């Protein structure tokens, strides 16, 4: 039974050295023809091969990153490692450990992939968000802007979760995150009944309830 489990530091700052570990079972890297490598995916982007290492200590690297990459192994412990020096926000990604043999019998394909370890690179210290209510200038749309926080995640509900239909909560974007949420209600609902954006940022122990006032 083949397993692949990656581990990394979760968060790291630019210029720092990323060390990743893949721990595997159900096959040996000392087996003739066996290899293990790493592929990464910057969140919401595509897939980028990084490095591969063979049973016999031979290694292959992506030339774009050659000066930053070192792949190594401890075959007795069932571990492969990748080192990436001088990381930058551009190296923010999910990193996957993959098996690939150079012989047809052992499997010349990426059949087995780990679940992946998320790596975020930013200079940011834990920073609470600012939470801003968004009032309009048959249905009416209200909004909430959650601005300048680190790290992820934040949770956002409307009326403590009571108002759940008609919500669009957008994926966060960037050294700090910003997120937004819209809610659409019938015109007679608001401003007669109160509507409140509830935002939590666990990392900074932040909890904010921001009521949407008409202007």
């Amino acid at each position: 039974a083949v397993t692949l489990k990656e581990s990394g530091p979760g968060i790291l700052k630019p210029s720092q050295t990323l060390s990743l570990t893949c721990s595997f079972s159900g096959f040996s890297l000392s087996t003739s023809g066996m290899g293990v490598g790493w592929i990464r995916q910057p969140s919401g982007k595509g897939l980028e091969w990084l490095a591969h290492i063979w049973w016999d200590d031979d290694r292959s690297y992506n030339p774009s990153l050659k000066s930053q990459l070192t792949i190594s192994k401890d075959a007795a412990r069932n571990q492969v490692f990748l080192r990436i020096t001088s990381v930058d926000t551009a190296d923010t990604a999910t990193y996957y450990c993959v098996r690939r043999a150079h012989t047809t019998v052992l499997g010349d394909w990426f059949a087995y992939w780990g679940q992946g370890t998320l790596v975020t690179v930013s200079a940011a210290k834990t920073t609470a968000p600012s939470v801003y209510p968004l009032a309009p200038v048959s249905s009416v749309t209200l909004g909430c802007l959650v601005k300048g926080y680190f790290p992820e995640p934040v949770t956002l509900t409307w009326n403590s979760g009571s108002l759940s239909s008609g919500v669009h909560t957008f994926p966060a974007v960037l050294d700090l995150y910003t997120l937004s949420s819209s809610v659409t209600v019938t015109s007679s609902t608001w401003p007669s009944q109160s509507i409140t954006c509830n935002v939590a940022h666990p990392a900074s122990s932040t909890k904010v309830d921001k009521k949407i006032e008409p202007r």
């Binding site: 939470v131 801003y132 968004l134 009032a135 200038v137 802007l145 601005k147």
Partner: peptide
Amino acid sequence: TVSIFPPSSEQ
């Protein structure tokens, strides 16, 4: 469906 919003007093 398009909706626009000014900066809040808070911001």
